[PDB]
């Protein structure tokens, strides 16, 4: 699944960029902290899963 | 070379080393925003 | 009289010289004066 590997990797790259901006903004805006802390919790786990996914898929394309 | 699987990312890899200096410059953008209080 | 924040004009101005100087260092390696 070559295309599927680069899809997970691009997914990981896009998610990183989103959270590179989102996490500091969410952290310093105390108005909507409760609304946001769930999203950083989600994105964080979504992020770790993508590393593992790309990590195992690498061994089927490399 | 990167392993051929990651080749589409060569241009992104080429620019990652400069990101640490951007943090230094970002501190100054930030201090200007707060007016160097 | 202050409608554009000063830190914004600073950053944009700073990024603009960064580009011009970067271009000058690029040209050190290409075309005239690259020794090639």
């Amino acid at each position: 699944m070559t295309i599927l590997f680069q899809l997970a990797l691009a997914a990981l790259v896009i998610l990183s960029f989103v959270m590179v901006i989102g996490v500091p903004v969410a952290y310093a805006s105390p108005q909507d902290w409760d609304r946001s802390k769930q999203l950083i919790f989600l994105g964080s786990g979504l992020w770790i899963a993508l590393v593992l996914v790309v990590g195992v898929l690498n061994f089927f394309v490399v | 070379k990167l392993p051929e699987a990651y080749a589409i990312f060569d241009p992104l890899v080429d620019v990652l080393p400069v990101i640490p200096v951007l943090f230094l410059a970002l501190a100054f953008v930030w201090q200007a925003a707060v007016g160097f209080r | 009289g202050g409608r554009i924040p000063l830190w914004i004009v600073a950053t944009v101005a700073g990024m603009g010289v960064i580009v011009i100087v970067g271009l000058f260092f690029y040209g050190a390696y290409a075309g005239l004066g690259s020794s090639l």
Partner: peptide, 30 residues
């Protein structure tokens, strides 16, 4: 090619000022 590198570094580069810009619109904890 090189535009590929330049669009990457342009987007990475604007990411920094954007966090400041957003926290300053939202009147965040700068």
């Amino acid at each position: 090619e090189v535009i590929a590198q330049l669009t990457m570094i342009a987007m990475i580069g604007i990411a920094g000022p954007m966090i400041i810009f957003l926290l300053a619109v939202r009147r965040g904890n700068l």
